[PDB]
Design a protein around this ligand. Structure first.
Ligand SMILES: O=C1C[C@H](NC(=O)OCc2ccccc2)C(=O)N1
Ligand SMILES: [Zn+2]
Length: 106
């Protein structure tokens, strides 16, 4: 089983087997209105995160879902976002691939 950890501190976050094909693919290369560019990978489940702020629909990369910022719960690195449906209760995470390290369970 392949595991995703926080690249900064090694906190365990998610699993390759939780990748989620939102819109057809887990990977979305996106930018926010301020011009920050991210390679986002969608996961159905994740742990080790602290969510901050209120949910927002602003410029959501996944139509019909609102986002909340997700930090590493250990080190405070910005690891991505939590998404929740605006009209149904599904949830998932969009995590910044380059802020994760993928490797074996060990
Ligand atoms: O789906 C989304 C999430 C994303 N939000 C965003 O970039 O908000 C600003 C921000 C929050 C925290 C760290 C960086 C930028 C956005 O514009 N669309
Ligand atoms: Zn961390």
């Amino acid at each position: 089983a392949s595991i995703f950890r926080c690249r900064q501190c090694g906190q365990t976050i998610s699993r390759r087997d939780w990748l989620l094909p939102m819109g057809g693919d887990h990977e979305h290369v996106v930018f926010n209105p301020a011009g920050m560019i991210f390679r986002v990978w969608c996961f159905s489940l994740a742990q080790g995160l602290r969510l901050i702020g209120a949910p927002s629909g602003e410029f959501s990369w996944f139509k019909g879902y609102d986002w909340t910022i997700a930090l590493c719960g250990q080190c405070g690195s910005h690891l991505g976002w939590h998404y929740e449906g605006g009209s149904q209760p599904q949830t998932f995470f969009g995590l910044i691939k380059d802020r994760l390290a993928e490797g074996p369970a060990d």
